[PDB]
Design a protein around this ligand. Structure first.
Ligand SMILES: Nc1ncnc2c1nc(Br)n2[C@@H]1O[C@H](CO)[C@@H](O)[C@H]1O
Ligand SMILES: [Mg+2]
Length: 390
């Protein structure tokens, strides 16, 4: 009579990493890609023979900086003249050009110079997330919910839908990232009465705090605040400067001018930073870092915490601003939700818990997966077509 319907997917289309989930058998499955990764880099690389997307693009970035595109989310739905765009362009190794006051990324691809709109680059990331899901389900996927930041305007939301349509996806709905994190915890299923929820989102390059009110499953964004110049990469930079100084003291050599050595040091620092979230110390072991000298050293969690102390404390300023804007007091917040990999940092959690006078933090859903989790829960709700009984 009626054939079984394919599952719909929830996609967190992130600035630096994207994540895909599916709700089946009363539970969400976050889908790992073919390299076993639960999150996929939002990177697209171009060569004379191939277009690479995800881990394959990010793993060759060092020798192909001009033709590897990342951060398209910072350009999506914006004008080329926008002050945000002009500032970001100074930090990017790829070319950004002006086509009718609309930014386009220009690269060498398959023997030609090619320019792409930000929605086209995002459609390539969405095609990879769709293929990750189809490899797990074993059938073609059509329907998806895609998330965006709460501060995205109409043009930014329409360009995200356009990216979905180019990728061959039927976009069920564009939902806000903090709303998706709240849905992941079922904070919209607690019944009658108003609930105030704070979402604390610390990413690779930006920090966002959102205050939502939930009443009978209805969401209202009460306040947004953040820091565009605060994220995981700033903590990596602090360890980089620390170890460059350490090499100078120990071997009387300045390494800061060999890009390969700085890159090898930064890659090692980012992994040591992750180890320090679960261990009280971490080792750093690089062979022939500079002038055939092996760099074998360590860093305690106490020293790393000291190195990033001002940065961690500065996350509380947008929290206080969001609470003033929402016209609420900290005691009036019912639930605290953590979003982003950088929230695993024990000191970040301690500062926030202390700010909210010992309150529990919702961190049981991996913070780098919570947004995709909630988008998957929403996607399964949106495709239901139940007919009422007599
Ligand atoms: N366990 C973790 N402890 C500390 N940091 C982490 C962890 N896992 C992830 Br993921 N990160 C950082 O999150 C950011 C996501 O873009 C990157 O800067 C990652 O380094
Ligand atoms: Mg995010």
């Amino acid at each position: 009579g009626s054939m079984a319907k394919a599952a719909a997917i929830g996609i967190d289309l992130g600035t630096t990493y994207s994540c895909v989930g599916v709700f089946q058998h009363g539970k969400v499955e976050i889908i790992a890609n073919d390299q076993g990764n639960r999150t996929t880099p939002s990177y697209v690389a171009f060569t004379d023979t191939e277009r690479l997307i995800g881990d394959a693009a990010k793993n060759q970035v060092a020798l192909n900086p001009q033709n590897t595109v990342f951060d398209a989310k910072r350009l999506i739905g914006r004008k080329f003249g926008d002050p945000v765009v002009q500032s970001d362009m100074k930090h990017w190794p790829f070319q950004v050009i002006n086509d009718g006051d609309k930014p386009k990324v220009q690269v060498s691809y398959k023997g030609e110079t090619k320019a792409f709109y930000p929605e086209e680059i995002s459609s390539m990331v969405l095609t990879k997330m769709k293929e990750i899901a189809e490899a797990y389900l074993g059938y073609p996927v059509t329907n998806a919910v895609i998330t965006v930041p709460a501060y995205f305007n109409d043009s930014q939301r329409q360009a995200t839908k356009d990216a979905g349509v180019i990728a061959g996806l039927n976009v069920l709905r564009i939902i806000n990232e903090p709303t998706a994190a709240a849905i992941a915890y079922g904070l919209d299923r607690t019944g009658k009465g108003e609930r105030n929820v704070l979402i604390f989102d610390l990413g690779g390059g930006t920090f966002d705090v959102s205050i939502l009110t939930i009443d009978d499953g209805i969401f209202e964004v009460k306040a947004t605040a953040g820091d565009t110049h605060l994220g995981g990469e700033d903590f990596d930079n602090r360890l980089v400067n620390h170890f460059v100084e350490e090499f100078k003291r120990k071997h009387k050599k300045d390494i800061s001018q060999n890009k390969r050595a700085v890159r090898r040091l930064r890659t090692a620092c980012e992994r040591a930073k992750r180890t320090l979230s679960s261990s009280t110390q971490a080792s750093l072991e690089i062979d022939s870092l500079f002038e055939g000298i092996d760099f074998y050293t360590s860093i305690t969690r106490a020293r790393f915490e000291e190195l990033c102390s001002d940065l961690f404390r500065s996350t509380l300023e947008p929290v206080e601003k969001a609470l003033r804007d929402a016209k609420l007091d900290k005691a009036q917040i019912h639930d605290l939700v953590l979003v982003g990999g950088s929230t695993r940092i024990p000191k970040v959690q301690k500062l926030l818990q202390d700010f909210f006078n010992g309150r529990d933090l919702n961190k049981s859903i991996n913070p780098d997966e919570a947004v995709a989790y909630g988008a998957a829960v929403q996607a399964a709700i949106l495709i239901k077509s139940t007919r009422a009984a007599a």
